[PDB]
């Protein structure tokens, strides 16, 4: 298709529903891949990272909370997301650090809970990287 269309959606409200995009960053389990036109169909897991939506207007960025980056052979990029990082208002250093310090105490509570706590600390550090 002409360029690439992005179906970036969030359960509270969809962000994009096929908007034309000049380039998409997709931080994944392996690594970020730039898809902008045609490309090949792909299925991939979106690791929490900055899914920056580069466009002719501006290269606005979004840190994802997780999702799947999948591609269809008709130049379709279905990116399902949960919580985004609107511009830079999402940035809040103090409460992020407070959660990281207060809950790393329970990072060794109980197998599943401990692992989820460690993962949440890791994604908080990802946000800290996005905090800049």
């Amino acid at each position: 298709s002409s360029g690439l269309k992005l179906q970036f959606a969030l359960p509270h409200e969809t962000l994009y529903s096929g908007s034309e995009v000049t380039q998409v960053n997709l931080p994944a389990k392996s690594g970020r891949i730039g898809v902008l036109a045609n490309h090949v169909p792909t299925v991939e897991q979106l690791l929490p990272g900055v899914v920056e939506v580069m466009e002719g207007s501006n290269s606005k960025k979004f840190f994802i909370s997780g999702g799947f980056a999948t591609v269809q052979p008709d130049s379709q990029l279905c990116v399902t997301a949960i919580e985004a990082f609107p511009l830079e208002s999402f940035s809040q250093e103090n409460i992020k650090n407070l959660l990281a310090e207060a809950k790393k105490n329970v990072s060794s509570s109980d197998a599943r809970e401990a692992a989820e706590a460690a993962i949440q600390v890791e994604v908080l550090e990802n946000l800290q990287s996005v905090l800049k």
Binding site: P48, E83, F90, I119, V123, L124
Partner: protein
């Protein structure tokens, strides 16, 4: 980290990441929607048709 064996499933890992984003979201972003997302009052009973009634396990 490890969320399959050490954790529970990809669903739990993703939910914990979403709760990370929501709870660590800045003050002006906090609204009724994120409060509803944080709010959870389900009770898992797991009817003992044969056995193993969970008795309203909290979510």
């Amino acid at each position: 980290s490890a969320w399959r064996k050490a954790g529970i499933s990809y669903a739990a890992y993703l939910n914990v990441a979403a709760q990370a984003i929501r709870s660590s979201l800045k003050t002006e972003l906090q609204t009724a929607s994120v409060l509803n997302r944080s709010q959870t009052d389900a009770f898992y009973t797991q009817y003992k048709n044969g056995t193993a009634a969970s008795e309203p396990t909290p979510i």
